[PDB]
Structure 1
């Protein structure tokens, strides 16, 4: 699998174990559901760009133990 290291605001090493075949859409929502926040509230940043709902770990250049950031959106949701 692919372990994505998400940088939490409280400095947490969130290790998301994703599957190389599933769209990041299901991963993005699952992250929100786990933290107890609605989707569109947090933006996932990868290489400066933000992961879209139609993005897959196959593109961009995602690898094992990769680093991904998460920040709150200006809208809050």
Structure 2
């Protein structure tokens, strides 16, 4: 019962993540930052423009298969 989320970076690159509806999104943020080789707190992760918290889950955010997460530099970063 995974959904696949597409994570889009500042440079238009994509990394997809298969997650459960109950997965704490901290797991995704940490993995993504690791693969980019930057500290996790230098980034902010947005779903439809709203900030994804470590303890948010896809269910709480109303996410579904194929949904996009955008990654921006943290604004006081961070």
Q: TM-score, normalized by length of structure 1? A: 0.86
The unaligned stretches of length 5 or more in structure 2 are none
Aligned-residue CA RMSD (Å): 1.4
Structure with a larger share of its residues in helix: 2
Aligned to 2:29: 28
Give distance in 2, aligned partners of 1:8 and 1:38.
14
Runs (4+) of structure 1 moved beyond 3 Å?
none
Measured after TM superposition, the shift of residue 75 of structure 1 is: 2.8
**Deviation per CA, 1:15-42, whole angstroms, max 9, x where unpaired?**
1222222211121111111111112111
The number of residues matched between the two structures is 77
Q: Distance in 2 between matches of 1:3 and 1:9?
A: 20
Superposed displacement of residue 74, structure 1: 2.5
Give the TM-score taking structure 2 as reference length.
Answer: 0.85
Offset of residue 62 of structure 1: 0.3
What 5-or-longer segments of structure 1 have no aligned partner? none
